[model samples]
Target chain A: SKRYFVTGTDTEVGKTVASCALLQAAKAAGYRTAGYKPVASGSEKTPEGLRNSDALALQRNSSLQLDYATVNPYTFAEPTSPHIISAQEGRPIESLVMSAGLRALEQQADWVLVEGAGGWFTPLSDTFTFADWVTQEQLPVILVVGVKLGCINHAMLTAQVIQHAGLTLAGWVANDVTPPGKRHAEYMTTLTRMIPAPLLGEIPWLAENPENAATGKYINLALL
Target chain B: SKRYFVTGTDTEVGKTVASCALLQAAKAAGYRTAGYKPVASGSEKTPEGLRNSDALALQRNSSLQLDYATVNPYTFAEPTSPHIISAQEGRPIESLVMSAGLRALEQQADWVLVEGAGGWFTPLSDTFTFADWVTQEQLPVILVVGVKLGCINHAMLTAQVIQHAGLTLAGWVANDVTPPGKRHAEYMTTLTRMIPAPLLGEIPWLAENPENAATGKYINLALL
Candidate 1:
């Protein structure tokens, strides 16, 4: 019944892929699960309407069912930061709306995975940030560490920032998102030693058709 | 004719008002003036397209008469932080673009009054900030202090940040932005005595039609 708010060091740092994998693993481990992305920006418009690939992935992977609107309260057409997109569109991301969405999602699932947009400190509005949202929700965090050349510094700094924002860092996911030929193992090992949280999963880089294989091979949900 | 960048302790703390007042005062003091705001978010769409209110105010007050586009390089319609706006727009704020814009303005004005968006440490990009822009532009600063209950601490912290960014605190303006309160005089006294920078002006709150009196009365141009 414990919930986890999943966030990444930066945008496109494999939060979606990791979240889906985690959801799959959690269901396999005999836990009913659901997910939420409080505010989603930069979504592709499908035949149905504006659909967030990240949120859709969560819905697909989750054992527990959820409506699209309930999962993502604010969805912007443009793929930009939530605050900027909101400002351009003349709608601010209301904390109350997001809070209401989270409460609704929590009622339906035994375990809820609240995924954050952009970086840890990325602003949701003029005054509040994703970190503030996490603190307001008062949920333990599962940070996704995107291993690259600067993984050591980015991961550690992100952890420190999360702590500063008054959230408990439950554990971390060491996701290999770097290009081939990069020293990912060395970087992941360094992060494992440096970060003061449990390494929930060490996702390996996919060798086959790089992009699709990357999404397909890593489906570990037990880590969540 | 020395140049100075005007930064506020917080947003809506009368940064634009003080900057425009400074421009008007500089003209009155027999010095040619121009202004620059490298990155602005939350603009009103006029016949001229995205028009930044803050930039327009400066343009109106400036005596040198520069184009509005030159004053603000990257303008987003969102009233959020610049970095968030940029990210939302999918064209993150570039240092080169800002530097180029600064160079163009630096060559045109005798005394450039560069106004920074939001507070001292507000990020213009992921890696760069308004403070970094100040350093890059090599302009000394004129801080705008919003005189209220927490003015002293905010002012001191901002001054420290300016120093830390390797920029000079040329002077400061004490803006009475708070609704008429009994603690006004006490806050003013504390700030003028404690702030290390020169008290350039003490602008009283405007009662009716602030625009008409903004240039002449509230702003004491003589101090600069």
Candidate 2:
């Protein structure tokens, strides 16, 4: 099974939306798609379980079945950076859970999409980040640039980190986090020129949750 | 002349403070000092001119005098990222401004410290960033990691970017960006272990401007 890491420029940059859409797209191509969230912070503990909506939605949309622990290794109730939360809890992400989980997930699925929390350089431990895991796993990356005022800088910075990590930034998406307007055009134009990778998809501003996306028309599956 | 590009983990991470302290330290060793800010956004419009405090402080501390244009070529009145402001103003940082400015600053001093805006990957133009310039000039870098919860991620990301750009991350600093806490020690330890550069300084939180700093005690000049 091939693995892809989905990272965003910032938190709530529509990564959940993008990954769900990605799983759907890959599934439509007649492949068994599996979604994996390595770790999630700011998770909610309900009667059902500790849930990260991003991780939950990925599991919901994917054709493959994975338990909560299998889907996301660490889930924290604190709505802050995962590294900081780990410090607060005195528990780092389980190393065995990640590599072994990835190996297992890959064996069962044709395509595995590993979604990262927050940004590419978001810390997993005091000394490691999603970039480290990607480097260790040797997974190609998919960037979800949260289209907004500072998207250019954020995207460029994220791109630099990704390339510098020696991992291939396979493709990227321009997610319209804001409403459609002149700002969007400017941001899109700048990113298109500067990103250095193929534009995987241009996800539009949705009136509803992307998981409820009634149309296959929301994303350009051909590009991915 | 020996030159070093001083960058940060983020904006207001004591790049100027460290740079000024660096100038004083180098000066004590009997070398003339100068500082250059390639571009600055979020500037103050005062009696002196439309100046950035960071740039103003550099000029104030230096033994080698330079005109505003020579020290900082781009000073935007708006408080935004440089790339966005450049797009808004229709005045991108002049391509010749940085390299040409550095060349002039070098000849006048035995050692020059070029301070960058925001972080290492901060955009100088639509297509180029400070990293691009650092690569172009082949300058060694001094990283100022702002001490906070996620300093580890920020610092690690910066180190990766600096190395991947093929520039030397000559040294780093751990500046107190937060109130007194145990957080700083955790961040500092991780940074020392992860960031492949020597710890050059550890600036205490100040009640005064860093330019008017009375001591070289905060920084280890030996590293630079």
Candidate 3:
């Protein structure tokens, strides 16, 4: 079984889209895939309960028939930082719960993709970050670099922090969250030189229904 | 002489505006201020030569009368990473040049606020980052965190990187670059707790000319 943690340079950087691509690629390669989003902040009230769109997208991509709760163990109503939301709602995010969720998914799938909330250093609480849990799980990471004006700095900082925490940066994906800037190619060239990881693929900006797009075609799964 | 390198979490995150505020506060406190922007990517092709708006803004707020060339030694035509522009144009950004520019300003002013091009780890050339130059010059850093969704992670990462590089994080200012989010106060509280520096001031999002706004009123110079 193979497991990789997906984290972005920042939120809205297409971590979920990248994670879905990874899952799609794995599924195409004859692997049973599971997409786990253990913690999420933003959500919509459904007939069942609170559901995060990112987690739902991940669940949709996964080859497994896991419950929504299994896919997303802890979700809050607010669209802010989970720590703040958790602290306010008196519902703290537990590492043990996330770990248990991952374990469940691990047993059911050959490839498990755990998509993280926000950037690497985003606080789960005053004392903990999602990175802490990822580190504890010893999951190799795949960074999703959102191509933008300040992406280079954010990407470099994130890669450094991930490596410094003693984790393997398995690969990276460049997702065009916004329309590619005039100097987009230049940005890509610079990032390839600076980041010490393999460039798995590049995802173009989807005009509509990005989650529904077959993003695996853009990803080179063999690199992982 | 007191010299501080002003860097942002990302581009257009009010590093220049915040640096200007710092200059305003310093000038009000009876300190002769100089604003230095040694390397800039985006610029207007002025009759006097290439001029960066950020560097020009810095010069406007400074107490010292300095030439545009002295204030900004290197200005690129395109708005992109300095390293990419440098390589494309065959004009390398020299560390010696920036160092000399800083030294010249240091001699003239009691407080020199050197604004960086992009974010903390923004590259000067393939071999160096703006951070590398700041570290070499032994300048204490003031981080300008643009208030937004993922600013917390950027702020924390930049702060950690600064401290790790053996640079003093003098203080940090929260600049409302975008309209304040619904959880704006929550973001501020979280940052104040996470970052190990003094909260300098909060700059409100300006509907009009932010550059001309008397931002010093927001900043507490005594904290510095």
Candidate 4:
């Protein structure tokens, strides 16, 4: 099974949106896919218990059937950075648990996308970061750059760090959070030249509650 | 002379404000200081020539008197990223020119703070970035992190890149772009624990056109 880690330049930089789109695209390519968000924050307390919108979305888009608990092993009530939320709640996010969750998904699917919270160096706990686990897992990264004023710098910073960590820089996608600016094309050109990976897609500004099939159209599974 | 390159996690993240405050603090400590913005964008044309507000602010705050051209050697008309503006205007920003400007300021001041446009990896042109020039100059860096929702990730990413480049991470400042959130203290604690530099200062939210002396009150010159 091909395993890929999906990370964003910053929080709310469309990591979930891009991840689901990738999973949908992978399924269209005839691979049974699983979307895993092992640790998540900002979850709502539903009748079924703690439910994160992102994790649920990932689970929904995944071709492989998964229970909510298996898809997201750790869910925090606070809608904040996972590290802070974990500490405040007196619950530690352990690598062993997350790794176990990832391994389970890999067994059931031909393609698995592990979506990370916030950015790449996002701390999972006081001592360790998401980067640490991803490095150990040796999962290739797919950067979801939320196109904004500071996207270029954030993307470049993230790309360099991913390269520095000696990980496989799989590819990237330019996800438009807002309408394209006049210089959007130019921004894309600069990123294309600077980042040392193929651009998997250029997702246009999607409306509310966009279906996986609609978002998947913007992505190219062949590029992955 | 102690020379430092001041950069923010992103643009409008208090690079100019922090630089001015540092310069003012240095003056209070009886050191002759000069603030330089070698390459700048977002300039307004005046009787003299193109003047960037940030560059002007830096020049005003510095104890050492310098001409506008000396403080800001490269000024672009467009109020956008320097690289994009440079390309469109067919005016390439050269590293040699910027380095020369720094050398000029260093000779005139005891402490020189070279404020960068936007973030650390902000491109100067199609081929080179401000990081390229700063690394070549071997200038130690002071990062001004804007306290916002996603600031932790931005600050950590910037800090790691600065450290990865082997530059002396002089220190960092937490500049409030807006009123402090409920978790402001916790955010500071996380940044303090994570970053490998001393906490230079934490600038509170300021009103319009704050005096450098007033802003400098929050900063500690002793830390540097």
List of chain A TM-scores, every candidate? 0.89, 0.92, 0.97, 0.97
Return the lDDT, model 1, position B10: 61
Candidate 3, residues A4-91, lDDT tens digits: the string is 9999998888888888888888999999999999898889999889999999999889998889999998989889899989999999
In terms of DockQ, the best-performing candidate is: 3
Worst 10 residues of 3 chain B by lDDT: B177-186
Residue A64 deviation, candidate 3, in Å? 1.5
lDDT of 1: 0.72
TM-scores for every candidate against the unseen true structure: 0.50, 0.79, 0.97, 0.96
Ranking by TM-score: 3, 4, 2, 1
Candidate 4, residue B99: Cα displacement in angstroms equals 1.8
Tens-place lDDT per residue, model 3, B18-120, is 8888889899999988999988988898788888999899989998888888898998989888998899899988889889888887777878888888898
For candidate 2, give the lDDT of residue B120: 67
**Candidate 3: lDDT over CA atoms?**
0.89
* Model 2, CA-based lDDT: 0.78
lDDT of 2 at B52: 84
Residue B70 deviation, candidate 3, in Å? 1.1
**Every model's DockQ, to 2 decimals?**
0.02, 0.24, 0.85, 0.68
Model 4 per-residue lDDT tens digits across residues B1-224: 99998988888787788888888888888999898898888889799989999889988998977899999999998867788988788888888888888888878897899998888888887888889898889999999998877787788888889888889899999898887677788888888998889999988888676544477778887877
Model 3: residues >4 Å from true position, as ranges? none
TM-score of 1: 0.50
